[PDB]
């Protein structure tokens, strides 16, 4: 409408419906392809999802220094794309072999960089795209809920495709989503207008200092969130690493236990989208902390729950819980962080607690998770994590800063208005 003649909306919206069609491939069916197509150690998928986190942490950062000190040049974001023209050659001809030709540490390391154009590129893409929403007038959130259908159709299509042939994907994702999610450039923007003639605006900014850090470090309420963050999350995070094959087991053909999976995920948007609607409202009445516990109570139940699975139906209810949670989490982390911290801090709070610490707590965790799914298989390991996760959760109905104890409108309603 207000975008019909608006072209970069189409451009970057479509660029969003392609960067996320690939996501919808590479991500949910990673476990499957690894372990099945490649047949890989129930504990060595850990040394992979492991190197995965150790780098998304060496890049999520350095990618800031680019994402902005670079501004409107697609440059960086063009490496990302070109690197994704080789999705195929890579897994098929390099990633797959390296691992499998059982040289595996020296194959993930040297193969966990096409994880760079995903872990610390997926957000990176999402930035650049809003810097355009500005200059070009889109409700960024109108073009991002564009790349949401792509990851919905992604899963569905891909899964069904995947079975039929794992190969006829890395070739689809490497073109179907590459040559376009790349060709969507020769038609773009740069113009130092629609911002300020000089530099009065153009691309929102912020700061992350040492003292800032050293200040938070002084703060306990930072620590208690660093508790919930490393405790409930990181832990849940890895729960999902492997979970996909633990899924496919409760099914007829494994080559049917996939599709279903691709389905449970496609229906996620079709769920989470709705959930997301109310959410705020709710979050803002329930009060952050509470809603962060709400998320651990589930996260938690899903782990323990899974540790007691017997059938398929159950397992297709655990994979559906992961959905209610998420909303109440990121949206919760947001509303708590904010209701509990100095806006100046906010920036740093994320990098420091949500990127440096969790990815760290995961470089380690997902190794003893795989080393654990061996000595005790899944369901056993699930009891461990399930408890450690719920434990911490009760510990937070205590630690996390309640609903504004020494300020309810100056440290709770202040940022609000």
Residue numbers at the binding site for Hg ion (CB under 5 A): 21-22, 57, 61, 148, 173, 176-177, 234-235, 273, 333, 355-356, 361, 365
Q: Is 226 helix (H, G, I), strand (E, B) or coil?
A: helix
- State which residue, 177 or 315, has the beta carbon closest to Hg ion: 177
State how far the alpha carbon of 97 is from the alpha carbons of 28, 89, 103, in Å: 21, 11, 9
Cα distance between residue 282 and residue 242, in whole Å: 32
Cα distance between residue 372 and residue 14, in whole Å: 42
* Total H helices, total E strands in the chain: 27, 0
Q: Minimum distance from CB of 209 to Hg ion (Å)?
A: 15
Tell me the HSE value of 134 on the side-chain side, using a 13 A CA sphere. Answer: 19
Q: Minimum distance from CB of 315 to Hg ion (Å)?
A: 23
Q: What is the DSSP code string of 263-274?
A: HHHHHHIIIIIH
Q: Minimum distance from CB of 15 to Hg ion (Å)?
A: 13
Q: Minimum distance from CB of 18 to Hg ion (Å)?
A: 7
- State which residue, 88 or 177, has the beta carbon closest to Hg ion: 177
Query: Could you tell me which residues come within 8 angstroms of residue 183 by beta carbon, excluding any fewer than 6 positions away?
Result: none
User: Cβ(280)–Cβ(339) under 8 Å?
Assistant: no
Q: Minimum distance from CB of 197 to Hg ion (Å)?
A: 36
- State which residue, 79 or 176, has the beta carbon closest to Hg ion: 176
- State which residue, 142 or 344, has the beta carbon closest to Hg ion: 142
Cα distance between residue 259 and residue 388, in whole Å: 32
Taking the CB of residue 30, how many other CB atoms lie within 10 A of it? 18
Q: Minimum distance from CB of 343 to Hg ion (Å)?
A: 15
Please choose, from the candidates 207, 148, 175, the residue with its C-alpha nearest in 3D space to the C-alpha of residue 345: 207
- State which residue, 208 or 250, has the beta carbon closest to Hg ion: 208
Residue with tokens 């890395």: 170
Q: Minimum distance from CB of 333 to Hg ion (Å)?
A: 3
- State which residue, 22 or 283, has the beta carbon closest to Hg ion: 22
- State which residue, 34 or 155, has the beta carbon closest to Hg ion: 155
Tell me 233's DSSP state.
Answer: I
Burial class (CB in 10 A: 0-12, 13-18, 19+), 345: buried
Cα distance between residue 17 and residue 11, in whole Å: 10
Cα distance between residue 14 and residue 147, in whole Å: 7
Q: Minimum distance from CB of 312 to Hg ion (Å)?
A: 26
- State which residue, 111 or 332, has the beta carbon closest to Hg ion: 332
- State which residue, 51 or 72, has the beta carbon closest to Hg ion: 51
**Tokens, residue 91:** 């897994």
Torsional class of 95: left (φ above 0), alpha (ψ -120 to 50), beta (otherwise): alpha
Q: Minimum distance from CB of 188 to Hg ion (Å)?
A: 21
């Amino acid at each position: 409408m207000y975008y019909l003649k608006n072209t970069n909306f189409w451009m970057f919206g479509l660029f969003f419906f392609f960067y996320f069609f690939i996501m919808g491939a590479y991500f949910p069916f990673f476990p499957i392809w690894l372990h099945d197509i490649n047949h890989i150690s129930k504990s060595d998928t850990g040394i992979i999802f492991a190197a995965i986190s150790l780098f998304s942490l060496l890049f999520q950062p350095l990618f800031g220094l680019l994402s902005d000190k670079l501004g409107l040049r697609k440059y960086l974001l063009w490496i990302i794309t070109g690197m994704l023209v080789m999705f195929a050659p890579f897994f098929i001809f390099i990633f797959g072999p390296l691992l499998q030709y059982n040289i595996l540490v020296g194959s993930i390391v040297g193969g966990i960089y096409l994880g760079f154009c995903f872990n610390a590129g997926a957000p990176a893409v999402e930035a650049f795209i809003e810097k355009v929403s500005r200059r070009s007038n889109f409700e960024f959130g109108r073009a991002r809920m564009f790349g949401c259908v792509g990851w919905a159709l992604g899963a569905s299509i891909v899964g069904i495709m995947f079975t039929i042939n794992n190969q006829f994907v890395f070739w689809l994702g490497s073109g179907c989503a590459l040559i376009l999610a790349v060709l969507l450039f020769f038609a773009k923007t740069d113009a130092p207008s629609s911002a300020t003639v000089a530099n009065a605006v153009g691309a929102n900014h912020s700061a992350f200092s040492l003292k800032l850090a050293l200040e938070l470090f002084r703060q306990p309420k930072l620590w208690f969130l660093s508790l919930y963050v490393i405790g409930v999350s990181c832990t849940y995070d890895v729960f999902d690493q492997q979970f996909a094959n633990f899924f496919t087991s409760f099914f007829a053909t494994g080559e049917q236990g996939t599709r279903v999976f691709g389905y449970v995920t496609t229906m996620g948007e079709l769920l989470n989208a709705s959930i997301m609607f109310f959410a705020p409202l709710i979050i803002n009445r329930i009060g952050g902390k509470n809603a962060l516990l709400l998320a651990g109570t589930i996260m938690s139940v899903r782990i323990i729950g899974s540790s007691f699975a017997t059938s398929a139906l159950e397992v297709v209810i655990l994979k559906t819980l992961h959905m209610f949670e998420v909303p109440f989490l990121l949206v919760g982390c947001f509303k708590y962080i904010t209701s509990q911290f100095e806006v100046r801090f906010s920036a740093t709070i994320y990098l420091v607690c949500f990127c440096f610490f969790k990815q760290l707590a995961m470089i380690f965790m997902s190794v003893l998770a795989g080393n654990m799914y061996e000595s005790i298989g899944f369901q056993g390991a699930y009891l461990v994590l399930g408890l450690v996760a719920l434990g911490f959760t009760l510990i937070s109905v205590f630690t996390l800063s309640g609903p504004g104890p020494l300020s309810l409108l100056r440290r709770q309603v202040n940022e609000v208005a």
